[PDB]
Coordinates of C-alpha atoms in Angstrom, one line a residue:
Chain A
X17 CA -9.3 24.9 -7.9
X18 CA -7.7 21.4 -8.2
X19 CA -4.3 21.8 -6.4
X20 CA -3.0 18.6 -8.1
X21 CA -3.4 19.7 -11.8
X22 CA -0.1 19.7 -13.6
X23 CA 0.7 20.8 -17.1
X24 CA -1.5 22.4 -19.8
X25 CA -4.9 21.3 -20.7
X26 CA -4.8 18.0 -22.6
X27 CA -5.6 17.2 -26.3
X28 CA -5.4 14.0 -28.3
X29 CA -1.9 15.1 -29.4
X30 CA -0.7 15.7 -25.8
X31 CA -1.9 12.3 -24.5
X32 CA -0.5 10.5 -27.5
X33 CA 2.9 12.1 -27.4
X34 CA 6.0 9.9 -26.7
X35 CA 7.1 12.7 -24.3
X36 CA 4.8 15.0 -22.5
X37 CA 5.5 18.6 -21.3
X38 CA 7.8 17.7 -18.4
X39 CA 11.5 17.0 -19.0
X40 CA 12.5 13.9 -17.1
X41 CA 15.5 12.5 -15.4
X42 CA 16.1 9.1 -13.9
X43 CA 17.9 7.4 -11.0
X44 CA 18.7 3.7 -10.4
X45 CA 17.7 1.7 -7.3
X46 CA 20.2 -1.3 -7.0
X47 CA 19.0 -4.7 -5.9
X48 CA 21.0 -4.1 -2.7
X49 CA 19.3 -0.6 -2.1
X50 CA 15.8 -2.2 -2.7
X51 CA 14.0 -3.4 0.4
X52 CA 11.3 -5.9 -0.7
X53 CA 11.8 -5.7 -4.4
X54 CA 14.5 -6.4 -7.0
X55 CA 15.6 -2.8 -7.7
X56 CA 14.3 -0.5 -10.4
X57 CA 14.6 2.8 -12.3
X58 CA 12.8 5.9 -11.1
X59 CA 11.8 8.5 -13.8
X60 CA 10.8 11.9 -12.5
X61 CA 10.1 15.5 -13.8
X62 CA 12.9 17.9 -13.2
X63 CA 10.5 20.9 -13.1
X64 CA 9.4 21.3 -9.5
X65 CA 7.8 24.7 -10.0
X66 CA 4.2 23.3 -10.1
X67 CA 4.6 21.2 -6.9
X68 CA 4.8 17.6 -6.1
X69 CA 3.6 14.7 -8.3
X70 CA 1.8 11.5 -7.8
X71 CA 3.8 8.3 -7.8
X72 CA 3.4 5.1 -9.9
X73 CA 5.0 1.7 -9.6
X74 CA 5.0 -0.7 -12.6
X75 CA 5.8 -4.5 -12.5
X76 CA 6.8 -6.8 -15.4
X77 CA 5.5 -10.3 -15.8
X78 CA 6.8 -13.8 -15.2
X79 CA 10.4 -14.3 -16.4
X80 CA 10.6 -10.6 -17.4
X81 CA 12.7 -7.7 -16.4
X82 CA 12.3 -3.9 -16.3
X83 CA 13.2 -3.8 -19.9
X84 CA 9.9 -5.3 -20.9
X85 CA 8.0 -2.3 -19.4
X86 CA 10.7 0.4 -19.5
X87 CA 9.1 2.5 -22.3
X88 CA 6.2 3.3 -20.0
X89 CA 8.5 4.9 -17.4
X90 CA 9.5 8.1 -19.1
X91 CA 6.4 8.3 -21.3
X92 CA 4.2 8.5 -18.2
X93 CA 6.6 10.5 -16.1
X94 CA 6.9 13.2 -18.7
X95 CA 3.2 13.8 -18.2
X96 CA 3.9 14.7 -14.6
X97 CA 4.4 11.6 -12.5
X98 CA 7.2 9.9 -10.5
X99 CA 7.4 6.4 -12.0
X100 CA 9.4 3.4 -10.8
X101 CA 9.7 0.4 -13.1
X102 CA 10.7 -2.5 -10.9
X103 CA 12.6 -5.8 -11.2
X104 CA 11.2 -8.5 -8.9
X105 CA 13.1 -10.4 -6.2
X106 CA 13.2 -13.3 -8.6
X107 CA 11.7 -13.4 -12.1
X108 CA 9.7 -16.5 -11.0
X109 CA 7.7 -14.6 -8.3
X110 CA 3.9 -15.1 -8.6
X111 CA 1.3 -12.3 -8.7
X112 CA 0.6 -12.0 -4.9
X113 CA 4.4 -11.5 -4.3
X114 CA 4.5 -9.0 -7.2
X115 CA 1.8 -7.1 -5.4
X116 CA 3.8 -7.0 -2.2
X117 CA 6.8 -5.8 -4.1
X118 CA 4.9 -3.0 -5.9
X119 CA 3.8 -1.7 -2.5
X120 CA 7.4 -2.0 -1.2
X121 CA 8.6 0.0 -4.2
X122 CA 6.1 2.7 -3.6
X123 CA 7.1 2.9 0.0
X124 CA 10.8 3.0 -1.0
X125 CA 10.0 6.3 -2.8
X126 CA 9.0 7.9 0.6
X127 CA 12.6 7.8 1.8
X128 CA 14.5 7.8 -1.5
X129 CA 16.9 10.8 -1.4
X130 CA 16.4 11.6 -5.1
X131 CA 12.6 11.7 -5.2
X132 CA 11.3 12.0 -1.6
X133 CA 10.6 15.8 -2.1
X134 CA 9.2 15.2 -5.5
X135 CA 6.3 12.9 -4.7
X136 CA 3.1 13.5 -2.9
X137 CA 3.3 10.4 -0.8
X138 CA -0.5 10.4 -0.3
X139 CA -1.1 9.9 -4.1
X140 CA 0.2 6.6 -5.4
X141 CA -0.8 4.1 -8.1
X142 CA 0.2 0.7 -9.5
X143 CA 0.4 -0.9 -12.9
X144 CA 1.8 -4.1 -14.4
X145 CA 2.0 -6.5 -17.3
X146 CA 0.5 -10.0 -17.1
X147 CA 1.6 -11.5 -13.7
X148 CA 2.6 -7.9 -12.9
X149 CA -0.9 -6.8 -13.6
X150 CA -2.2 -9.5 -11.3
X151 CA 0.3 -7.9 -8.8
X152 CA -1.2 -4.5 -9.4
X153 CA -4.7 -5.8 -8.6
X154 CA -3.3 -7.5 -5.5
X155 CA -1.6 -4.3 -4.4
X156 CA -4.9 -2.4 -4.8
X157 CA -6.8 -5.2 -3.0
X158 CA -4.3 -4.8 -0.1
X159 CA -4.4 -1.0 0.0
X160 CA -7.6 1.0 -0.5
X161 CA -5.6 4.3 -0.3
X162 CA -4.1 3.7 -3.8
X163 CA -5.5 6.1 -6.2
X164 CA -5.4 4.0 -9.4
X165 CA -4.6 0.5 -10.6
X166 CA -3.9 -0.5 -14.2
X167 CA -3.4 -4.2 -15.0
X168 CA -2.2 -4.6 -18.6
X169 CA -3.1 -8.1 -20.0
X170 CA -3.2 -9.1 -16.3
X171 CA -2.8 -12.7 -15.3
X172 CA -3.7 -14.0 -11.8
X173 CA -5.2 -17.1 -10.3
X174 CA -7.4 -14.8 -8.2
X175 CA -10.4 -13.8 -10.2
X176 CA -12.5 -12.1 -7.5
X177 CA -11.6 -8.4 -7.0
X178 CA -14.7 -7.4 -4.9
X179 CA -12.2 -6.0 -2.2
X180 CA -10.8 -3.3 -4.5
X181 CA -11.7 0.3 -3.7
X182 CA -9.2 1.9 -6.1
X183 CA -10.3 3.1 -9.6
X184 CA -9.1 0.5 -12.0
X185 CA -8.6 0.4 -15.8
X186 CA -8.4 -3.2 -17.0
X187 CA -6.6 -3.3 -20.4
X188 CA -7.1 -6.6 -22.3
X189 CA -5.6 -7.8 -25.6
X190 CA -8.3 -9.3 -27.9
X191 CA -6.1 -12.2 -29.2
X192 CA -4.4 -13.0 -25.9
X193 CA -3.8 -16.7 -25.5
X194 CA -1.7 -16.5 -22.3
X195 CA -4.1 -14.4 -20.1
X196 CA -7.2 -14.7 -22.3
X197 CA -9.6 -11.8 -21.6
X198 CA -12.6 -14.1 -21.0
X199 CA -11.0 -15.8 -18.0
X200 CA -8.6 -13.1 -16.8
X201 CA -9.2 -9.4 -17.8
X202 CA -12.9 -9.5 -18.2
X203 CA -13.4 -11.7 -15.2
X204 CA -11.4 -9.2 -13.1
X205 CA -13.6 -6.3 -14.4
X206 CA -16.8 -8.1 -13.7
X207 CA -15.9 -8.8 -10.1
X208 CA -14.7 -5.3 -9.2
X209 CA -17.6 -3.6 -7.3
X210 CA -20.5 -2.2 -9.3
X211 CA -20.0 1.2 -7.7
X212 CA -16.3 1.5 -8.4
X213 CA -15.0 3.9 -10.9
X214 CA -13.6 1.5 -13.5
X215 CA -13.1 0.7 -17.1
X216 CA -12.3 -2.2 -19.4
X217 CA -10.5 -1.5 -22.7
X218 CA -9.8 -4.4 -25.1
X219 CA -7.1 -3.8 -27.7
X220 CA -8.2 -5.0 -31.2
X221 CA -6.1 -7.6 -32.8
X222 CA -3.5 -7.4 -30.0
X223 CA -1.4 -10.2 -28.7
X224 CA -0.5 -10.8 -25.0
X225 CA 2.8 -8.9 -25.6
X226 CA 1.3 -5.6 -26.8
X227 CA 2.5 -3.8 -23.6
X228 CA 6.1 -4.9 -24.1
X229 CA 6.9 -2.4 -26.9
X230 CA 5.4 1.1 -27.3
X231 CA 1.6 1.1 -28.0
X232 CA 0.0 4.5 -28.3
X233 CA -3.5 3.3 -27.2
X234 CA -2.1 1.8 -24.0
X235 CA -0.1 4.9 -23.2
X236 CA -2.8 7.5 -23.9
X237 CA -5.5 5.8 -21.8
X238 CA -3.1 4.9 -19.0
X239 CA -2.1 8.6 -18.9
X240 CA -5.7 9.7 -18.9
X241 CA -6.6 7.2 -16.1
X242 CA -3.6 8.3 -14.0
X243 CA -4.4 11.9 -14.5
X244 CA -8.1 11.5 -13.7
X245 CA -7.6 9.4 -10.5
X246 CA -4.1 10.1 -9.1
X247 CA -4.5 13.9 -9.7
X248 CA -8.3 14.0 -9.6
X249 CA -7.8 15.9 -12.9
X250 CA -11.3 16.4 -14.4
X251 CA -9.6 17.7 -17.6
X252 CA -8.9 14.1 -18.5
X253 CA -12.4 12.6 -18.1
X254 CA -13.2 13.7 -21.7
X255 CA -11.0 10.9 -23.1
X256 CA -12.7 8.1 -21.1
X257 CA -16.3 9.3 -21.0
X258 CA -18.1 8.4 -23.2
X259 CA -16.3 5.5 -24.9
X260 CA -13.7 6.8 -27.3
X261 CA -14.3 5.9 -31.0
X262 CA -11.0 4.2 -31.6
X263 CA -10.5 1.3 -34.2
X264 CA -7.7 0.1 -31.9
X265 CA -10.3 -0.6 -29.2
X266 CA -12.5 -3.8 -29.8
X267 CA -14.5 -3.7 -26.6
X268 CA -15.0 -1.0 -23.9
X269 CA -16.9 -0.6 -20.6
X270 CA -16.7 2.3 -18.2
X271 CA -18.7 3.5 -15.2
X272 CA -19.0 7.0 -16.5
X273 CA -19.4 9.7 -15.3
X274 CA -16.7 9.2 -12.7
Chain B
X19 CA -0.6 -28.9 12.9
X20 CA -0.3 -25.5 14.5
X21 CA -0.2 -26.2 18.3
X22 CA -1.5 -22.7 19.2
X23 CA -4.9 -22.9 17.4
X24 CA -7.7 -22.5 19.9
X25 CA -11.5 -22.6 19.5
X26 CA -13.9 -23.4 16.6
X27 CA -13.2 -22.4 13.0
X28 CA -14.0 -18.7 12.7
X29 CA -16.8 -16.8 10.9
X30 CA -17.8 -13.2 10.6
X31 CA -20.3 -13.9 13.4
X32 CA -17.8 -15.5 15.7
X33 CA -15.3 -12.6 15.4
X34 CA -18.1 -10.0 15.8
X35 CA -19.6 -11.7 18.9
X36 CA -19.7 -9.7 22.1
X37 CA -18.7 -13.0 23.8
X38 CA -16.9 -15.6 21.8
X39 CA -16.6 -19.4 22.2
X40 CA -14.6 -19.4 25.4
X41 CA -16.3 -18.7 28.7
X42 CA -14.3 -16.3 30.8
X43 CA -13.5 -15.7 34.4
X44 CA -11.6 -12.8 36.0
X45 CA -9.3 -11.8 38.8
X46 CA -8.2 -8.4 40.1
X47 CA -4.7 -7.2 40.6
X48 CA -4.7 -4.5 43.2
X49 CA -2.5 -1.4 42.8
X50 CA -0.4 -2.6 45.8
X51 CA -0.1 -6.1 44.2
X52 CA 1.0 -4.7 40.8
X53 CA 4.7 -4.3 40.3
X54 CA 5.4 -1.7 37.6
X55 CA 1.8 -0.7 36.8
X56 CA -1.3 0.6 38.5
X57 CA -3.2 -2.6 38.9
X58 CA -5.7 -4.2 36.5
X59 CA -8.2 -6.9 35.8
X60 CA -7.2 -10.2 34.2
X61 CA -9.8 -12.0 32.0
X62 CA -9.0 -15.6 31.1
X63 CA -10.7 -18.6 29.4
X64 CA -11.8 -21.3 31.8
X65 CA -11.4 -24.1 29.1
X66 CA -7.9 -25.6 29.7
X67 CA -8.4 -28.5 27.4
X68 CA -6.4 -27.1 24.4
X69 CA -3.5 -25.9 26.5
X70 CA -2.2 -22.5 27.4
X71 CA -3.1 -19.2 25.7
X72 CA -1.3 -16.1 24.5
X73 CA -1.4 -13.0 26.7
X74 CA -2.4 -9.4 25.9
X75 CA -2.1 -6.2 27.9
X76 CA -4.2 -3.1 27.2
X77 CA -3.5 0.4 28.3
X78 CA -5.9 3.4 28.6
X79 CA -4.9 6.9 27.5
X80 CA -4.0 10.2 29.2
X81 CA -6.2 11.0 32.3
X82 CA -8.1 7.8 31.8
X83 CA -8.8 4.7 33.8
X84 CA -9.0 1.0 33.2
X85 CA -12.8 1.5 32.7
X86 CA -12.2 3.4 29.5
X87 CA -11.0 0.2 27.8
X88 CA -12.6 -2.5 30.0
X89 CA -15.0 -3.8 27.4
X90 CA -12.1 -5.1 25.3
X91 CA -10.9 -7.4 28.1
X92 CA -13.6 -10.1 28.2
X93 CA -14.5 -9.6 24.5
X94 CA -11.0 -10.6 23.4
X95 CA -10.4 -13.1 26.2
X96 CA -13.5 -15.0 25.2
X97 CA -11.7 -15.7 21.9
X98 CA -8.9 -17.6 23.7
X99 CA -6.5 -15.1 25.3
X100 CA -5.5 -14.1 28.8
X101 CA -6.1 -10.3 28.7
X102 CA -5.1 -7.8 31.4
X103 CA -6.7 -4.3 31.2
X104 CA -4.4 -2.0 33.3
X105 CA -4.5 1.2 35.2
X106 CA -1.3 3.2 35.0
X107 CA 0.8 4.3 37.9
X108 CA -0.6 7.8 37.5
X109 CA -3.2 9.1 35.1
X110 CA -0.7 11.6 33.8
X111 CA 1.9 9.0 32.6
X112 CA 3.3 9.7 29.1
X113 CA 3.4 7.2 26.2
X114 CA 6.8 5.6 26.8
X115 CA 6.0 5.1 30.4
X116 CA 2.7 3.4 29.4
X117 CA 4.8 1.1 27.3
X118 CA 7.0 0.1 30.2
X119 CA 3.8 -0.5 32.2
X120 CA 2.2 -2.7 29.5
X121 CA 5.3 -4.9 29.5
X122 CA 5.3 -5.0 33.3
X123 CA 1.7 -6.1 33.3
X124 CA 2.5 -8.9 30.9
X125 CA 5.5 -10.0 33.0
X126 CA 3.2 -10.0 36.0
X127 CA 1.1 -12.8 34.5
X128 CA 3.7 -15.5 35.1
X129 CA 3.7 -14.7 38.8
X130 CA -0.1 -14.6 39.2
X131 CA -1.3 -17.8 40.9
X132 CA -4.7 -17.6 39.1
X133 CA -3.3 -17.4 35.5
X134 CA 0.4 -18.3 35.5
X135 CA -0.3 -21.9 34.3
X136 CA -2.8 -20.7 31.7
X137 CA -0.4 -18.5 29.6
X138 CA 2.4 -19.1 27.1
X139 CA 4.8 -16.3 28.3
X140 CA 6.6 -16.6 24.9
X141 CA 3.4 -15.4 23.0
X142 CA 2.3 -11.9 24.2
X143 CA 0.9 -8.7 22.7
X144 CA 0.3 -5.1 23.6
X145 CA -2.6 -2.7 22.9
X146 CA -3.8 0.7 24.0
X147 CA -5.8 3.7 23.3
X148 CA -4.3 7.1 22.3
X149 CA -1.3 7.7 24.6
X150 CA -1.8 4.0 25.6
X151 CA -1.4 3.1 21.9
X152 CA 1.7 5.2 21.7
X153 CA 2.7 3.1 24.7
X154 CA 2.0 -0.1 22.7
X155 CA 4.3 1.1 19.9
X156 CA 7.0 1.9 22.4
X157 CA 6.6 -1.5 24.1
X158 CA 6.9 -3.2 20.7
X159 CA 10.0 -1.2 19.7
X160 CA 11.5 -2.1 23.1
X161 CA 10.8 -5.8 22.9
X162 CA 11.4 -7.6 19.6
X163 CA 10.0 -10.8 21.1
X164 CA 6.5 -9.4 21.3
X165 CA 4.1 -11.1 18.9
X166 CA 1.6 -8.4 18.1
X167 CA 0.9 -4.7 18.8
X168 CA -2.3 -2.8 18.3
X169 CA -2.4 1.0 18.8
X170 CA -6.0 2.3 18.8
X171 CA -6.2 6.0 17.8
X172 CA -2.6 6.2 19.0
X173 CA -1.0 9.4 20.1
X174 CA 2.8 9.9 20.3
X175 CA 5.2 12.7 19.7
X176 CA 7.5 10.1 18.1
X177 CA 6.5 9.5 14.5
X178 CA 9.3 7.2 13.3
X179 CA 8.7 3.6 14.2
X180 CA 11.3 2.0 11.9
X181 CA 12.8 -0.1 14.7
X182 CA 9.5 -2.1 15.3
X183 CA 9.8 -5.8 14.5
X184 CA 6.4 -6.8 15.9
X185 CA 3.4 -7.3 13.6
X186 CA 1.3 -4.2 14.1
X187 CA -2.3 -3.3 13.4
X188 CA -2.7 0.5 13.5
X189 CA -6.4 1.5 14.0
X190 CA -7.2 5.1 13.1
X191 CA -10.4 7.0 13.5
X192 CA -11.2 8.9 10.3
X193 CA -12.5 12.1 12.0
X194 CA -10.0 12.2 14.9
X195 CA -9.0 15.7 15.8
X196 CA -6.9 14.7 18.9
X197 CA -4.6 12.2 17.4
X198 CA -5.4 12.9 13.7
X199 CA -4.6 10.0 11.5
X200 CA -2.5 12.1 9.1
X201 CA 0.0 13.1 11.8
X202 CA -0.4 10.1 14.2
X203 CA -1.8 6.7 13.1
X204 CA -0.8 7.0 9.4
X205 CA 2.6 8.5 10.1
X206 CA 3.3 5.6 12.4
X207 CA 2.1 3.0 9.8
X208 CA 4.2 4.6 7.0
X209 CA 7.4 4.6 9.1
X210 CA 7.1 0.9 10.3
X211 CA 9.5 -1.2 8.2
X212 CA 8.3 -2.0 4.7
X213 CA 9.1 -5.7 5.4
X214 CA 7.0 -6.0 8.6
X215 CA 3.7 -7.7 8.6
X216 CA 1.4 -4.7 9.4
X217 CA -2.0 -3.2 8.7
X218 CA -3.8 0.1 8.9
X219 CA -7.5 0.1 9.5
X220 CA -9.4 3.5 9.5
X221 CA -12.8 3.6 11.1
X222 CA -15.3 5.6 8.9
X223 CA -16.7 8.7 10.5
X224 CA -15.2 7.8 13.9
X225 CA -14.1 10.2 16.6
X226 CA -11.0 9.8 18.8
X227 CA -13.1 8.1 21.5
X228 CA -14.5 5.2 19.3
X229 CA -12.4 2.7 21.4
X230 CA -13.9 3.8 24.7
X231 CA -17.2 2.1 24.2
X232 CA -17.9 -1.2 22.4
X233 CA -17.1 -1.0 18.6
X234 CA -17.6 -4.2 16.7
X235 CA -15.2 -3.3 13.9
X236 CA -12.4 -2.6 16.4
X237 CA -13.1 -5.8 18.2
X238 CA -13.4 -8.2 15.2
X239 CA -10.1 -7.1 13.5
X240 CA -8.2 -6.9 16.8
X241 CA -9.3 -10.5 17.4
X242 CA -8.2 -11.5 13.9
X243 CA -4.8 -9.8 14.3
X244 CA -4.2 -11.4 17.7
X245 CA -5.2 -14.8 16.3
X246 CA -3.0 -14.5 13.3
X247 CA 0.1 -13.3 15.1
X248 CA -0.1 -14.4 18.7
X249 CA -1.3 -17.8 17.7
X250 CA 0.1 -17.9 14.2
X251 CA -3.4 -19.0 13.3
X252 CA -3.8 -19.1 9.5
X253 CA -7.6 -19.6 9.9
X254 CA -7.7 -15.8 10.6
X255 CA -5.7 -14.6 7.5
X256 CA -9.0 -14.6 5.5
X257 CA -10.3 -11.7 7.5
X258 CA -7.2 -9.5 7.0
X259 CA -6.2 -10.3 3.4
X260 CA -7.4 -8.7 1.1
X261 CA -9.0 -5.5 2.4
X262 CA -12.3 -6.3 4.2
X263 CA -15.4 -4.7 2.7
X264 CA -17.0 -3.4 6.0
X265 CA -18.9 -0.1 5.6
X266 CA -17.4 0.9 9.0
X267 CA -13.9 0.9 7.4
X268 CA -13.1 4.0 5.4
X269 CA -9.5 2.8 4.6
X270 CA -7.5 -0.4 4.9
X271 CA -3.9 -1.4 4.1
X272 CA -2.1 -4.5 4.9
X273 CA 1.2 -6.2 3.8
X274 CA -0.5 -9.3 2.5
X275 CA 0.2 -12.1 2.2
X276 CA 1.6 -12.4 5.7

């Protein structure tokens, strides 16, 4: 029996829902309380009766604040995760620094009074938009114990991710002109190791900013990826393997079965 | 230019070599000659043309002698370091006492006629196996001027190392049942300050005693860590950031960029 399974068996409706089965609360980490990042908001399930949850840190991109990624916080946490949306030390920080800050935010959770007993500190994951997605890849490259990484329209000068050992879902936007998929997202996917459990999902017709307001395709597959790899939850593989038949997806690759 | 750089530009071959680019000589410190430790062997480079070298002290574990870590002495010294492998005052000394003895051995070097003019006493580091690695962590916490610390399969009853200010590489052995990584090595790493330059390297399939005979993965990354932090040698950051791909490493984390 998988001890990390949380919540009832999933369906298309359950993974598409704006709020999953877990009621959520939130707490604020001030810039002064944040060591190594710019503060953030932690969203967590209030129901502790099924045990501890994996933890996820999410970074915004260049010039952006938590508000550009905030919707992901409670939408993911309500599926059974402790999720921190961060602000960066400055909004001009580059991807490598964003990766250091994502790790600092995860480590903050280990001692945070509100959530220390709610997380399984051994099961953590990273996500981010654009430079924040470059930061998520950097954080995985620097920490092979992370269970999942999800760069959303990621931007980074670093194109070679052969060092990553963390299952990674790369989400590109077809019409992205800021972090074009050919030179960013797809290049990242192609340099991740052949053997790694990974996937590439390109969002049809989407601009670079698709992640900055609610997008059901982004949410449902991020949830499935986090469930499958943070929780080792085999109930969620069905949404990723084989490729889903989804008009919202213009290209797809995945190393199924995982 | 960094005045502390020593030796040719590094490669995987050079950091993996049993003997690096510097020829070495040795001198013995008798138990009677040793103030605050049980004696030792000092290995040092004979090439003085680049100036003085940083110094490193290495402690064995409980019940063990210098011979259980001796191979590390000339292997590290041949990369450009003055390295003393110690015996402890008694074989039953506990971790904090081993830390005091590591510092005493380092402080000995400035009084030793053979090597006193070969060292930079402002650039020193500590290492040790099991209780000796607990001693290295203690010595680091108790001397914020130390430049690097490397506990190898460290054992300590103290799990909270939040006061350490010295860049630390924690080397775990995946299958260790004596100082299991979950309750020793990883607990130490997780409690080191988030802001500290630090790394955790887990040796795949390794037992507690992997450090007691030559292990190339242990040597190469210890050398890279000492270079990066004792010498501030940026030529060695490439081996530590991002996670190396070695098969012999089952897990790696580091607070890159340093």
